[PDB]
């Protein structure tokens, strides 16, 4: 449960793998470069 000191704000990104994270700050903590901003999409 070692989880990145990250804002509240409601900012999501695609990450590299294709996962949607809470921000950028949490998305790059996790390990991962982002692909764009916004929820990525599940395929449709």
Do not use: H, Q
Not at 6 to 25: E, F, H, W
């Amino acid at each position: 449960k070692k989880v990145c000191a990250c804002p509240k704000i409601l900012k999501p990104v695609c990450g590299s793998d294709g996962r949607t994270y809470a921000n950028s700050c949490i998305a790059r903590c996790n390990g991962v470069s982002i692909k764009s901003e916004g929820s990525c999409p599940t395929g449709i």
